């Protein structure tokens, strides 16, 4: 479940947007017009900071060359056109094509371009070598739509064409490596995921569909419809584990990369969608739509963040990982629900994309979760300590140690950063918990087994969302999409049993002892002492202690549980935008 925030941050009305592309240090959009100029937008200031004006005709390609501080543009009247973007002067001009121009790749690490166009071809030009066609690739049968570099291998390339082929070629032929072939219809967009993990290329075509090809096998992977027209663009987000898809239909869907299930939609109203731009670093995405462009933001509806017992925070803003501590502030100046001023400071750019970041018990290390990994480091200055591949993470209450999930079948446990056994839970693990006990999650129910030797304590027939317990493992809290239950742990019921032998296929008998049931969905959670604090679906902020419920805030958005402080009798809370709000409790 990703839950992606998407928040407008630039919108461009003008006419036909053919390209867009992201400066990689400067805050830039380019955008290329049917109208033959080429604009760049400041996308915080949301200033129009340049205007070339390049012909009379559409400009279908523009791409910034940052090492050399230029544009380089192609135009439907077969001319490449550069422009220095600092002087705004046209550096160099020459003839490319026999028809339009239709994209532009840039080699990320020699003096190269690659050109594509309405002529069949591909051709290849060296700017160190006085723009000189150093290869034509031949082999499409119609127009060259889009061409991209394979970003592990610079010396392949793929292109999509109108003959409903795409190609996969090598810099020092002139003839395809291969053909990929299985689209009904002509292919618009072609794209290649950056991950050493998968071989794959994403099209788009007339057909209305989206394919994903594996290139070492040449076959395709997988076919997404739900476009209801023509799909123009398609793309693999560098950072996020994503799939930007748009059409002529006007919308722009946006998919999970490893699942392929649609998380959302989008209807600008701008019309037909025509291109997309991401940038590696950044959580940006450029579209260029009939009526203009605009700039999004892929932010998290749920923020990645975990404070510890002393209140330092770590989070996550997109692949920056950062440390928080609030400011000292008196009884006089702290009034509860207000945001609380904090010292922000940067700790580093993590490896993977952060979905989840968690603190051990004592707070001295910190797991960071994303798209089937996981790093942990040294919460003092996030320093790396062990890393590795899961599907889920799980720490235990005695600090330095912890639980990895495999799937839906291997439970890995692990003590002083080394593995110290493995085992396989007899109805699956659809998901694994944490804490005094590891719990597991199955088809059948709920399952507790003990951390030191993965021995079975106790089958529940439940389905669980949130597990929590006490400080002491006295308590539990087992929280479904319905209701939640709080349970005493009988630790002597199991000493005895392990040794005695009330034993069945379910575990030891008088083990847990239901203590009570509440009619209430926990979103978040924690216990202070006897008393488990928890957000409600309907944002309510109330404890459980002894039976009652007791009501602490109504919230006015939707809030985290963070920690309690007990020096400063306060419980701490955060929102999507980070910002930290309290509670007092005596």
Not at 128 to 157: A, L, R
Not at 260 to 285: F, K
Not at 384 to 391: E, V, Y
Not at 535 to 563: C, F, K, P, Q
């Amino acid at each position: 479940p990703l839950r992606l925030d998407i928040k407008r941050k630039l919108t461009a009305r003008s006419d036909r947007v053919k390209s867009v592309d992201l400066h990689p240090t400067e805050p830039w959009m380019l955008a290329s017009l049917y109208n033959g100029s080429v604009c760049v937008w400041n996308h915080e200031t949301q200033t129009l900071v340049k205007t070339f004006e390049v012909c009379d005709l559409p400009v279908r390609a523009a791409k910034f060359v940052a090492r050399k501080n230029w544009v380089v543009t192609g135009a439907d009247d077969m001319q490449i056109r550069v422009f220095n973007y600092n002087t705004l002067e046209r550096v160099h001009m020459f003839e490319a094509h026999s028809d339009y121009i239709r994209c532009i790749a840039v080699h990320p690490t020699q003096p190269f371009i690659l050109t594509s166009s309405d002529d069949m071809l591909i051709k290849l030009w060296d700017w160190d070598k006085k723009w000189s066609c150093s290869q034509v690739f031949e082999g499409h049968t119609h127009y060259v739509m889009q061409i991209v570099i394979n970003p592990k291998d610079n010396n392949q390339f793929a292109s999509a064409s109108l003959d409903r082929t795409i190609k996969v070629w090598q810099l020092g032929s002139s003839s395809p490596n291969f053909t990929l072939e299985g689209h009904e219809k002509g292919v618009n967009c072609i794209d290649y995921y950056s991950g050493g993990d998968k071989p794959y290329l994403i099209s788009g075509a007339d057909d209305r569909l989206v394919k994903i090809w594996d290139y070492q096998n040449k076959t395709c992977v997988q076919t997404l419809e739900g476009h209801a027209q023509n799909v123009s663009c398609a793309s693999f987000h560098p950072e996020l584990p994503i799939i930007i898809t748009g059409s002529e239909d006007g919308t722009v869907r946006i998919w999970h990369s490893s699942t392929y299930r649609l998380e959302s939609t989008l209807n600008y109203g701008m019309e037909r969608v025509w291109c997309v731009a991401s940038l590696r670093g950044s959580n940006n995405v450029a579209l260029g739509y009939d009526e203009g462009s605009i700039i999004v933001k892929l932010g998290r509806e749920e923020p990645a963040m975990s404070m510890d017992a002393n209140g330092k925070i770590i989070w996550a803003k997109h692949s920056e990982v950062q440390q928080a501590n609030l400011k000292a502030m008196g009884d006089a100046e702290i009034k509860d629900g207000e945001r609380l001023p904090l010292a922000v400071k940067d700790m580093g750019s993590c490896e993977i994309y952060p979905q989840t970041i968690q603190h051990n018990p004592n707070g001295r290390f910190v797991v960071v979760c994303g798209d089937g990994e996981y790093i942990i480091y040294t919460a003092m200055a996030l320093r790396n300590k062990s890393f590795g591949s899961a599907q889920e993470f799980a720490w235990a209450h005695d600090s330095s140690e912890y639980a990895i999930r495999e799937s839906n079948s291997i439970v890995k446990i692990f003590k002083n950063f080394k593995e110290k056994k493995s085992f396989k839970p007899d109805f699956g693990a659809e998901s694994i918990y944490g804490g005094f006990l590891l719990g597991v999650r199955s088809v059948n129910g709920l399952a507790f087994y003990d951390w030191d030797n993965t021995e079975l304590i106790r089958r529940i027939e439940i389905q669980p969302k949130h597990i929590f317990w006490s400080d002491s493992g006295e308590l539990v809290c087992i929280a479904t999409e319905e209701s939640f239950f709080i349970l005493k742990y009988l630790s002597e019921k199991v000493l005895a049993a392990q040794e005695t032998h009330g034993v069945t296929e379910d575990g030891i008998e008088d083990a847990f002892e239901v203590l009570g049931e509440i009619q209430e969905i926990v979103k978040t959670g924690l216990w202070v002492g006897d008393c488990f604090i928890y957000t409600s679906s309907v944002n309510r902020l109330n404890y459980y202690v002894g039976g009652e419920i007791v009501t602490i805030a109504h919230l006015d958005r939707t809030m985290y549980l963070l920690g309690y402080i007990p020096k400063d009798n306060r419980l701490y809370l955060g929102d999507k935008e980070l910002n930290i709000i309290s509670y007092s409790l005596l």
